[PDB]
Short mmCIF file of N, CA, C and O in Angstrom, two decimals:
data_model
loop_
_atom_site.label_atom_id
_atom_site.label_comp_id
_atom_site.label_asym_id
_atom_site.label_seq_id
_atom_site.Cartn_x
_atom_site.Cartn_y
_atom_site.Cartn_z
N UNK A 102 97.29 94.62 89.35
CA UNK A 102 97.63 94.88 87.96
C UNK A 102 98.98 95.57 87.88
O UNK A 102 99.66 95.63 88.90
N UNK A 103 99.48 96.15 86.61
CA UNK A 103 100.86 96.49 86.43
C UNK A 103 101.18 97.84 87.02
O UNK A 103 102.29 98.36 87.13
N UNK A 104 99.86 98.40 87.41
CA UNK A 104 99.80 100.11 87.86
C UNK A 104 99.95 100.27 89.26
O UNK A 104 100.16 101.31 89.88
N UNK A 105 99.80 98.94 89.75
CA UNK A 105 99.83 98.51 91.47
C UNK A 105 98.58 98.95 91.73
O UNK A 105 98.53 100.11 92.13
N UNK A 106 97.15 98.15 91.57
CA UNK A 106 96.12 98.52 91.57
C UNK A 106 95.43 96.80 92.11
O UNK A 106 95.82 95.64 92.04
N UNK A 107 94.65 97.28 92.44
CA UNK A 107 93.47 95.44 93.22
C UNK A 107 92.31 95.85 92.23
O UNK A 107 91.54 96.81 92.30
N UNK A 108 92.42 94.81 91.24
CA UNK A 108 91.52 94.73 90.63
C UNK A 108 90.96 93.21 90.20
O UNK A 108 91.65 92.21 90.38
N UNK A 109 89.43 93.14 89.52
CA UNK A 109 88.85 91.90 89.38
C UNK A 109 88.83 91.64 87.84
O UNK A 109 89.16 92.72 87.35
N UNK A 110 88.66 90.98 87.09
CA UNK A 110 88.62 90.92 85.72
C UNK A 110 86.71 90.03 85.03
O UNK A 110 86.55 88.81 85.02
N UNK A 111 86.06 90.65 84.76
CA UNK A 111 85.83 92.31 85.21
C UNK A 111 87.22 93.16 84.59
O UNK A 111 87.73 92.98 83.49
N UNK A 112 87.63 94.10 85.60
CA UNK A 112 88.92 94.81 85.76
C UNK A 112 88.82 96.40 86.30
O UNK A 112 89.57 97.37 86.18
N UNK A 113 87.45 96.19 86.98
CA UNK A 113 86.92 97.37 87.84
C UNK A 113 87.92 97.65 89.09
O UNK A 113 88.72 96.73 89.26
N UNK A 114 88.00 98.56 89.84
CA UNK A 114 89.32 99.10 90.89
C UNK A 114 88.16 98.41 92.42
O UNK A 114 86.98 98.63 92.70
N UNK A 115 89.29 97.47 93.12
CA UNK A 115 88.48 97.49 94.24
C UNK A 115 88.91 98.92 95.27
O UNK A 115 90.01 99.47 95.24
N UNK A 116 88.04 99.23 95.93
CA UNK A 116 88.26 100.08 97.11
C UNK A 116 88.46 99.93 98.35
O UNK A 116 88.44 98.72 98.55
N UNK A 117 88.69 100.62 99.58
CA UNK A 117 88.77 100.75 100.37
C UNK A 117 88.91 101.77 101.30
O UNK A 117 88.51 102.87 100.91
N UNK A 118 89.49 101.70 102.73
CA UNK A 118 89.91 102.96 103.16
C UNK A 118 91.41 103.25 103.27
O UNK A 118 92.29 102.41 103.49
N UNK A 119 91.54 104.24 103.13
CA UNK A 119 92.81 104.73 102.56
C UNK A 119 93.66 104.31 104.23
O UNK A 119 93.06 103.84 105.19
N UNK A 120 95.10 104.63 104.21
CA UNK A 120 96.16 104.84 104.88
C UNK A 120 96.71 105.80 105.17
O UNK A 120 96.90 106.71 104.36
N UNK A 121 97.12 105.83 106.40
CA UNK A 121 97.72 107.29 106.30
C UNK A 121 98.44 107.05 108.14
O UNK A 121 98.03 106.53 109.18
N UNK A 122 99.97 107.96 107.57
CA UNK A 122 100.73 107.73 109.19
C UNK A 122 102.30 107.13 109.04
O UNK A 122 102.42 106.46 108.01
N UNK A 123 103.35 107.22 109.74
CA UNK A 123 104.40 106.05 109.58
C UNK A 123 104.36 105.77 111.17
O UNK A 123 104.66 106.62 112.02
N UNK A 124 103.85 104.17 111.51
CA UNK A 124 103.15 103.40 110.11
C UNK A 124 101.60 104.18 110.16
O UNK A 124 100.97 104.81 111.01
N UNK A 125 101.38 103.71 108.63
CA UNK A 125 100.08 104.11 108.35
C UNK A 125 98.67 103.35 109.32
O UNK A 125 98.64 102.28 109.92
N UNK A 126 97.65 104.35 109.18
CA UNK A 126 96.88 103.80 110.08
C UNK A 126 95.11 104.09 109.10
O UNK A 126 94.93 104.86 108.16
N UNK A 127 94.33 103.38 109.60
CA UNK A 127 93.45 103.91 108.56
C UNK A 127 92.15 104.19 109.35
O UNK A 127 91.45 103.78 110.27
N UNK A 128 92.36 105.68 107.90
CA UNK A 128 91.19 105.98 108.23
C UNK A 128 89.43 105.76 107.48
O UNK A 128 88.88 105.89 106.38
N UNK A 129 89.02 105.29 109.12
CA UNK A 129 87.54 104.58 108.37
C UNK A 129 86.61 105.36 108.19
O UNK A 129 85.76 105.10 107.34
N UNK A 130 86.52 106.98 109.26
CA UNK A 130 85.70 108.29 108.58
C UNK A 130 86.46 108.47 106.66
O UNK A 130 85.68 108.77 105.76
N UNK A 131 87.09 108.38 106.53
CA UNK A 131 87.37 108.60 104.99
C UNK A 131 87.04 108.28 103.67
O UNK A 131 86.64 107.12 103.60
N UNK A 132 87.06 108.75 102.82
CA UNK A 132 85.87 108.29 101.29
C UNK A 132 86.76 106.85 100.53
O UNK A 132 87.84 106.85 99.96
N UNK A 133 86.20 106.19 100.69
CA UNK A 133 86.48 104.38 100.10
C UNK A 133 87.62 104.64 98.81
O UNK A 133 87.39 104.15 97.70
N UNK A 134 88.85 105.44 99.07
CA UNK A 134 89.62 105.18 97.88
C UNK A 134 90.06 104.26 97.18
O UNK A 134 89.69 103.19 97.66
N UNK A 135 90.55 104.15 96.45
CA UNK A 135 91.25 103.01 95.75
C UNK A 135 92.45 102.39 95.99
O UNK A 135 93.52 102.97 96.15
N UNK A 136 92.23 101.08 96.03
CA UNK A 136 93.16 100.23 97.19
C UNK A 136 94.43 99.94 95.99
O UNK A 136 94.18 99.46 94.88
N UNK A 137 95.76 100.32 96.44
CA UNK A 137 96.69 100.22 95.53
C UNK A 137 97.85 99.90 96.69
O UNK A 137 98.00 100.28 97.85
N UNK A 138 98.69 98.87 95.66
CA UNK A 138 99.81 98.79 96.24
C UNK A 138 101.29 98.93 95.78
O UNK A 138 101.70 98.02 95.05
N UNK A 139 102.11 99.88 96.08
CA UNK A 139 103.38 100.28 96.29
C UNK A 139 104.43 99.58 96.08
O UNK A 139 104.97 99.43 97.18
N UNK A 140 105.06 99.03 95.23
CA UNK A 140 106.20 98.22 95.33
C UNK A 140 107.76 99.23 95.98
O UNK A 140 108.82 98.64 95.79
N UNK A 141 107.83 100.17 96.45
CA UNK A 141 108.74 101.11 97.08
C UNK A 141 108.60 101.16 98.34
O UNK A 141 107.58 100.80 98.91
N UNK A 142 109.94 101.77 99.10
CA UNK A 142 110.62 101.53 99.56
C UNK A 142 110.00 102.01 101.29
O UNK A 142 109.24 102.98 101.25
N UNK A 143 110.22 101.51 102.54
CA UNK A 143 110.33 101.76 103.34
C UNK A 143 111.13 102.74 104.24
O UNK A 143 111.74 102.10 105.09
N UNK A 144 111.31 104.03 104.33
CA UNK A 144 111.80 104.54 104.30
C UNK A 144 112.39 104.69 106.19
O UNK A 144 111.65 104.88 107.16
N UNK A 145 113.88 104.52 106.20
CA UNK A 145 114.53 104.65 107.64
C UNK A 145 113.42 105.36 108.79
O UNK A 145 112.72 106.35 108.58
N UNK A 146 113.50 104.61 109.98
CA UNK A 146 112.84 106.07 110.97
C UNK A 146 113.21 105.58 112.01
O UNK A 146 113.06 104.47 112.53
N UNK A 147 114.09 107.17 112.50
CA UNK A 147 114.99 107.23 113.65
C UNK A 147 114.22 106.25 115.06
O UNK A 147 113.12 105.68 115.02
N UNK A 148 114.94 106.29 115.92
CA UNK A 148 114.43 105.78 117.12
C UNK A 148 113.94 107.06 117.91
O UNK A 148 114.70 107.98 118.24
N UNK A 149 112.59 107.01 118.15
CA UNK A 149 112.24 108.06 118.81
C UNK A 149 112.31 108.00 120.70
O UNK A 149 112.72 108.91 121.41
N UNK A 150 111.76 106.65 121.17
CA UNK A 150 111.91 106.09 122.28
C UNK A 150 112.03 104.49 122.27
O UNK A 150 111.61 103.72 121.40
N UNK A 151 112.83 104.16 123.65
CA UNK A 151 113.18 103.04 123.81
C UNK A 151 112.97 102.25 124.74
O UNK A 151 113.44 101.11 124.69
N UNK B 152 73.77 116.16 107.27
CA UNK B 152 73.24 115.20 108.34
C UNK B 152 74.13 114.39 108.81
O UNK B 152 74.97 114.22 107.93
N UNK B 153 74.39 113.75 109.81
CA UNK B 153 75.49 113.02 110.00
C UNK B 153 75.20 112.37 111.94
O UNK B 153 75.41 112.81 113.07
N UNK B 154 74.66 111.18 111.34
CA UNK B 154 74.51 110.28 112.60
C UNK B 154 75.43 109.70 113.16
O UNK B 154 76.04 108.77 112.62
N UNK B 155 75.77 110.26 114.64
CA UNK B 155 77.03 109.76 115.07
C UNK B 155 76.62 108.88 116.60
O UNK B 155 75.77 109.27 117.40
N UNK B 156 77.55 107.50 116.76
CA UNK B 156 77.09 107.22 117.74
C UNK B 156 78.68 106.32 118.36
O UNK B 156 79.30 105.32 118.00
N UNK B 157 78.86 107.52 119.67
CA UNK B 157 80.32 107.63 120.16
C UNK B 157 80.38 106.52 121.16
O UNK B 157 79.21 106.23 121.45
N UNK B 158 81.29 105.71 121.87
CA UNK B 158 81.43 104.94 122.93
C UNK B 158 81.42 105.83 124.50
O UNK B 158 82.50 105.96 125.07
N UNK B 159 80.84 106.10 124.79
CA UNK B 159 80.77 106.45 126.06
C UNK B 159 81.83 106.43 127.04
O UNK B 159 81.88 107.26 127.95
N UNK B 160 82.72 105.46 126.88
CA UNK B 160 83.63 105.32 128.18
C UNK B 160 85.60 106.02 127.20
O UNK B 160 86.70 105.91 127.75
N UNK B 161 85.34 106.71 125.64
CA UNK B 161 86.37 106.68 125.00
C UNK B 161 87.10 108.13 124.87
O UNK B 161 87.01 108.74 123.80
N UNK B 162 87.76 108.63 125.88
CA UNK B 162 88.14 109.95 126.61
C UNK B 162 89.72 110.31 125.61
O UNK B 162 90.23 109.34 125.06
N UNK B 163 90.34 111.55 125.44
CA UNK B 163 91.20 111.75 124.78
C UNK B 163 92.77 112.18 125.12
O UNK B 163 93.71 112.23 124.32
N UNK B 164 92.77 112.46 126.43
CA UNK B 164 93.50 112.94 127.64
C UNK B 164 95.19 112.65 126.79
O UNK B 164 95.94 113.62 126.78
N UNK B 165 95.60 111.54 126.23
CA UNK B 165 97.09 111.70 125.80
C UNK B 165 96.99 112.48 124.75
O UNK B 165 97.93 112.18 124.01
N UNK B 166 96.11 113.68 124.08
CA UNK B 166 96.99 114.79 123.63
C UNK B 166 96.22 115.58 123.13
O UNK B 166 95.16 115.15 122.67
N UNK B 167 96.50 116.76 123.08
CA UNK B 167 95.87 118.26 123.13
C UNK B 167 95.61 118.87 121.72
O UNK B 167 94.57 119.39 121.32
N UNK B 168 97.00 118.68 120.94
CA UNK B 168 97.36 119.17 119.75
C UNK B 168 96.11 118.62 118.32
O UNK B 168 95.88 117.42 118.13
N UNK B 169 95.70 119.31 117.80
CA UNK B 169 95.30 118.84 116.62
C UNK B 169 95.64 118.71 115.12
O UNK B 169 95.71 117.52 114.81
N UNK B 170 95.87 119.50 114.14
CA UNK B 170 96.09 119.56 112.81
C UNK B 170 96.16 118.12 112.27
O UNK B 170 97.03 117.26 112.18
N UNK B 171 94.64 118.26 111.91
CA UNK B 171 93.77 116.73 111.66
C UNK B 171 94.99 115.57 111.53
O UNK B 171 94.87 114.61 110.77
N UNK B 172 96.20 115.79 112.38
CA UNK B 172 97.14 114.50 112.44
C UNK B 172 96.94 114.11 114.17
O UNK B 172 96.67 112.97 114.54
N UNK B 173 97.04 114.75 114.70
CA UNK B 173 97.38 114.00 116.12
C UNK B 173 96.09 113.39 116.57
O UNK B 173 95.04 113.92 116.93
N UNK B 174 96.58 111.74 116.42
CA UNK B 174 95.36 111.13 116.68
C UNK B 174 94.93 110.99 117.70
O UNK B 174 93.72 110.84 117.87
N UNK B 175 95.99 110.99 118.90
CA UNK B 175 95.79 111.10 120.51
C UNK B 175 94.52 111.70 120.70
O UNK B 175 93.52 111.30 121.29
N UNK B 176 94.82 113.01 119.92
CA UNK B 176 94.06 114.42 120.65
C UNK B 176 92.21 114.21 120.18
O UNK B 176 91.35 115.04 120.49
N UNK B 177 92.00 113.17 119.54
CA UNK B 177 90.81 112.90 119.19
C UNK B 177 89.99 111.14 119.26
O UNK B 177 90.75 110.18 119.34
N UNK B 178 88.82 110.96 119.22
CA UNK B 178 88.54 109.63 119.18
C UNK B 178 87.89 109.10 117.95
O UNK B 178 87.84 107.92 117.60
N UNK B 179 87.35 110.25 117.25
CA UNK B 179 86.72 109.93 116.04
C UNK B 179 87.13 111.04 114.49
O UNK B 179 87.09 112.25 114.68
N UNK B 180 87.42 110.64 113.39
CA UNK B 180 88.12 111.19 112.16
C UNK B 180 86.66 110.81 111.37
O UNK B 180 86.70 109.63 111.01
N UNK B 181 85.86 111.23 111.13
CA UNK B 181 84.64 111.22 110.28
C UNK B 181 85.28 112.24 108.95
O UNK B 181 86.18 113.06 109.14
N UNK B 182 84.64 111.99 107.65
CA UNK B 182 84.85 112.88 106.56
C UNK B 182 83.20 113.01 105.69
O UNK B 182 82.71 111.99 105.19
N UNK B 183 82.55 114.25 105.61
CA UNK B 183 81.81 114.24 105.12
C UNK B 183 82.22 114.73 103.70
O UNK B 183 83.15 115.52 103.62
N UNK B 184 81.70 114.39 102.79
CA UNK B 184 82.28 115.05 101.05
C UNK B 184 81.02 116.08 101.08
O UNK B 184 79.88 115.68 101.34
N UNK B 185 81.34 117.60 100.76
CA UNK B 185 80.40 118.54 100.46
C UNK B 185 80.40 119.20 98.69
O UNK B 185 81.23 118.88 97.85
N UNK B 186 79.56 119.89 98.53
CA UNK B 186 79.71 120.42 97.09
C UNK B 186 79.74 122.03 97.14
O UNK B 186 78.87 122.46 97.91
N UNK B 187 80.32 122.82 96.67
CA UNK B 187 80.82 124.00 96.63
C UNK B 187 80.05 124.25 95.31
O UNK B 187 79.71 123.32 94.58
N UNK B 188 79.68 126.13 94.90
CA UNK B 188 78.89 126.55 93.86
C UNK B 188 78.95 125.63 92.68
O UNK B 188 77.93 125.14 92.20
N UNK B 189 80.24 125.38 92.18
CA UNK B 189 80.71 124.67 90.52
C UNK B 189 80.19 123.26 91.26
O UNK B 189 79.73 122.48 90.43
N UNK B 190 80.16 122.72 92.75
CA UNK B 190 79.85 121.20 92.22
C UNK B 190 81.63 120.56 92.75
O UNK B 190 81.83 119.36 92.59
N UNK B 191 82.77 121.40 93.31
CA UNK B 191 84.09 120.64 93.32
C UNK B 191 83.89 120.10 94.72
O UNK B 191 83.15 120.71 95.49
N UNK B 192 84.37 119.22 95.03
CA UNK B 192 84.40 118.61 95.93
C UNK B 192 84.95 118.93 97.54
O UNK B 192 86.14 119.22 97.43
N UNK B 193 84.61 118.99 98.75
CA UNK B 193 85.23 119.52 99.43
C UNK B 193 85.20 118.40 100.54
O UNK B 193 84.29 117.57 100.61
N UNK B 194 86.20 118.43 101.34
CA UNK B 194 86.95 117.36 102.85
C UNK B 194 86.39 117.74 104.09
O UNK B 194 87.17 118.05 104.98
N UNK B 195 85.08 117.77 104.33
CA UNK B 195 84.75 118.02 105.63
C UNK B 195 85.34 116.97 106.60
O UNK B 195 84.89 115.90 106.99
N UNK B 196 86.21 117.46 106.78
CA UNK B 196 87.01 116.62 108.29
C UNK B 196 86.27 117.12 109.47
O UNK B 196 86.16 118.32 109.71
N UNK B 197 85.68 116.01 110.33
CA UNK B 197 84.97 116.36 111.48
C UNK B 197 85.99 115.14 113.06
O UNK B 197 86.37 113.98 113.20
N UNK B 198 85.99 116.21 113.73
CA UNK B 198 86.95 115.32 114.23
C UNK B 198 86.04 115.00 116.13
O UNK B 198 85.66 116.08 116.57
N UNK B 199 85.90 114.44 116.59
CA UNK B 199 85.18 113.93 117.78
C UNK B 199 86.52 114.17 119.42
O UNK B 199 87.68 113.77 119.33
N UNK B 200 86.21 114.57 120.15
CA UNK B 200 87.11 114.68 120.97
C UNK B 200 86.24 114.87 122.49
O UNK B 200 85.49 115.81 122.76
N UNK B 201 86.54 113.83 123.28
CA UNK B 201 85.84 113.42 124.55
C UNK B 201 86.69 114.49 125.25
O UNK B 201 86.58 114.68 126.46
#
């Protein structure tokens, strides 16, 4: 939808497990948040090893 | 209550550090939701470490 949200119409919020990390990683101990998506930006990350 | 059932052979040895980020340092991120006097919600982060 326009809020960056996964929804059914209906138009109830689907869920899931959240993200978290760069990159994000998920966590499946965690409470089924609401699955949304981000149209922004990726943000630079240095080279740590090579 | 909280039924947990770990892999046996899944050890944690690449890293020591915790502050519920370093995922090395653990094998399992469980979250139980608890209720406090008013009823607010609280993040039981339980974290598993072989």
């Amino acid at each position: 939808d326009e809020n960056r949200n996964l929804v059914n119409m209906q138009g109830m919020q689907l869920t899931g497990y959240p993200a978290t990390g760069t990159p994000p990683t998920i966590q499946q101990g965690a409470n089924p948040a609401p699955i949304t998506i981000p149209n922004t930006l990726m943000a630079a990350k240095s080279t740590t090893t090579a | 209550s909280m039924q947990i059932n770990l892999n046996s052979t899944d050890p944690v040895p690449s890293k020591t550090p915790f502050s519920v980020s370093d995922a090395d340092s653990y094998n399992k991120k469980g979250t139980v939701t608890v209720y406090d006097s008013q009823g607010n919600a609280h993040d039981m982060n339980v974290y598993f470490v072989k």
